[PDB]
């Protein structure tokens, strides 16, 4: 209530002096009065706490913040302490939110809370501070300060954007989608460690493209355009190649449709969907496996390889076993199944002759490890009353000498029943996270060496501590200078040449 009283005091004083006196008066009296009173009472009341800035900002009082901004703008050094207190409150809130102690926190909920806090602060700024530059700079610096204390935030943002991109069930129209994407990229602007963020974005791209074929078809372009306008060129070229692969895949699809429109000699190519992807934009995953191929898939792969070596010569295909899908026409009705490129070898062995066992499908298949077990248990283990691959030894755990049969199961009226045992979770189990963290760390560790050599080859040198400043300046936009690490690393090249330092005395370099 003091702020309204002092504003009324200012208004009444200025009105009384302007109506009751001359023009050469006014400014001195009101100037000194407001100076002294505002300075003293501001100090006391807005740095004590009593209905202070922290409390009036926590509960969300828009009028109080607006009147405070409009009153404190007249006196110098008021906005400075206002922004300092706001930054202190933001630091406290972040430390209460970015707390690492305690396991069992939801990533998407954490990102949603951070985004809600950012949006609330932006709304308060727009409503009260009239888009002041100082407040924006202070909040940006504070976000940069409290956001880089961890390393799981970028992956959580990636999973949030994957959830927003997989389906636009929330916000069917386009305006709100555009606004939320803009807010997401604005939040990403004040974020560090872009390497792991973009790696997880590529992982989400691989997950959504190799399992879904109708993701957005219109928002992918918007996503990658925002990446172009936001990031530089490190993995944006990776995304370029990723989309180039889809373009070439559809061009190959239509030209192959023209190919089978002109005859086709034998059958086996009944209904095929072959795709062309490059190795430099889609990673292997683990090892480029060498498993077997079912017969109709064998014919399809042979035809595709012959075409690619005939009309796209100069490059050879490499076979791998991680991705794909197929429809298995089974047969009282004819229900078509779905096999994800792994159990279809077992179904090949069954097409030749069923009533096999685990030994039969592990000996005459060149089949991989426990991923085989997960693929095989899809048709038998954990199955509802639409079982298509039944066994006599009904049990949960998998045996070796167990026979497989078939049940018609007329209850399965669905003619495109699928068994989606794969893609149970998308949590990115530690192994791959750690390996890609090591990969991006090595990427940074050789990028810094490339920068230091490329710059100091076009520049001069130092005696004790001159060049470190230039490399920190040119790596300022990348990450922290890390003086100890660079100091320990620059002296490791002395056992070689390229402007070393000389073992006997570290001061004469190989110029």
């Amino acid at each position: 209530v003091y702020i309204k009283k002092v504003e009324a005091r200012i208004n009444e004083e200025i009105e009384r002096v302007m109506h009751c006196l001359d023009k050469s008066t006014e400014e001195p009296i009101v100037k000194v009065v407001e100076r002294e009173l505002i300075s003293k009472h501001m100090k006391t009341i807005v740095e004590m706490e009593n209905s202070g800035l922290v409390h009036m900002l926590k509960n969300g009082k828009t009028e109080d913040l607006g009147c405070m901004y409009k009153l404190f703008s007249r006196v110098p050094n008021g906005l400075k302490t206002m922004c300092e207190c706001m930054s202190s409150y933001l630091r406290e809130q972040g430390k209460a939110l970015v707390s690492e102690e305690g396991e069992g926190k939801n990533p998407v909920d954490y990102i949603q809370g951070l985004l809600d806090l950012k949006s609330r602060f932006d709304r308060f700024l727009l409503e009260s501070f009239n888009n002041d530059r100082l407040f924006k700079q202070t909040i940006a610096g504070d976000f940069e300060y409290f956001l880089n204390l961890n390393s799981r935030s970028p992956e959580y943002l990636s999973l949030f954007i994957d959830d927003k991109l997989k389906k636009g069930v929330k916000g069917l129209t386009e305006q709100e989608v555009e606004t939320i994407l803009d807010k997401a990229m604005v939040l990403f602007r004040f974020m560090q460690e872009k390497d792991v963020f973009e790696r997880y974005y590529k992982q989400h791209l691989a997950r959504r493209l190799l399992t879904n074929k109708s993701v957005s078809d219109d928002s992918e372009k918007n996503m990658i355009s925002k990446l172009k306008t936001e990031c530089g060129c490190q993995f944006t070229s990776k995304l370029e190649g990723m989309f180039r692969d889809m373009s070439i895949s559809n061009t190959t699809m239509d030209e192959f449709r023209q190919h089978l429109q002109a005859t086709g000699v034998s059958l086996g190519g009944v209904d095929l969907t072959v795709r062309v992807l490059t190795t430099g934009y889609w990673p292997t995953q683990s090892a480029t496996p060498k498993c077997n191929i079912p017969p109709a898939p064998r014919h399809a792969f042979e035809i595709f390889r012959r075409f690619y070596l005939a009309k796209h010569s100069g490059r050879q295909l490499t076979l791998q076993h991680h991705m794909g899908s197929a429809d298995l026409n089974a047969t009282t009705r004819k229900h078509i199944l779905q096999v994800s490129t792994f159990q279809m070898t077992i179904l090949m062995l069954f097409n030749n002759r069923e009533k096999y066992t685990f030994e039969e499908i592990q000996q005459e298949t060149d089949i991989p490890e426990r991923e085989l077990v997960r693929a095989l248990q899809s048709l038998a283990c954990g199955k509802p009353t639409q079982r298509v691959l039944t066994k006599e030894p009904k049990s949960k755990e998998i045996e070796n000498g167990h026979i497989f049969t078939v049940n018609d199961q007329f209850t399965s009226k669905l003619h495109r029943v699928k068994i989606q045992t794969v893609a149970a979770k998308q949590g990115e189990s530690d192994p791959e996270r750690k390996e890609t963290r090591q990969k991006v760390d090595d990427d940074r560790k050789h990028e810094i060496e490339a920068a230091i050599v490329r710059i100091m080859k076009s520049r001069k040198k130092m005696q004790h501590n001159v060049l470190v400043a230039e490399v920190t300046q040119q790596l300022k936009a990348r990450f922290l200078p890390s003086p100890v690490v660079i100091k320990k690393r620059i002296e490791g090249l002395i056992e070689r040449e390229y402007l070393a330092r000389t073992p006997e005395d570290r001061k004469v370099y190989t110029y």
Binding site: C233, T318, N329, E354
Partner: protein, 89 residues
């Protein structure tokens, strides 16, 4: 049969080779040194001169296209157009 495969949605990966037996800047060969090094001996230290591969799969000696990027100009096939995707054949 009791089961029959109808469709397939395979993913086919491919690798880039365009293997040839000639060079461009030194006019000698893909391997067996270049104009700036001639012989195998005379301070090679296991012949520190290998083959450089670009994103477009074109192949040159590392030294050849390195001096190409250094001597005449850097703009033709710069870091935006020509990448460094491999080292050695």
């Amino acid at each position: 049969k009791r089961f029959e495969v109808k469709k397939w949605n395979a993913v086919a990966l491919w690798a880039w080779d365009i293997v040839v037996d000639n060079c461009a800047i030194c006019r000698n060969h893909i391997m067996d040194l270049c104009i700036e090094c001639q012989a195998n001996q005379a301070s090679a230290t296991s012949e520190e001169c290998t083959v450089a591969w670009g994103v477009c799969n074109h192949a040159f000696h590392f030294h050849c296209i390195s001096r190409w990027l250094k001597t005449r100009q850097v703009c033709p096939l710069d870091n935006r157009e020509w990448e460094f995707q491999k080292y050695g054949h």
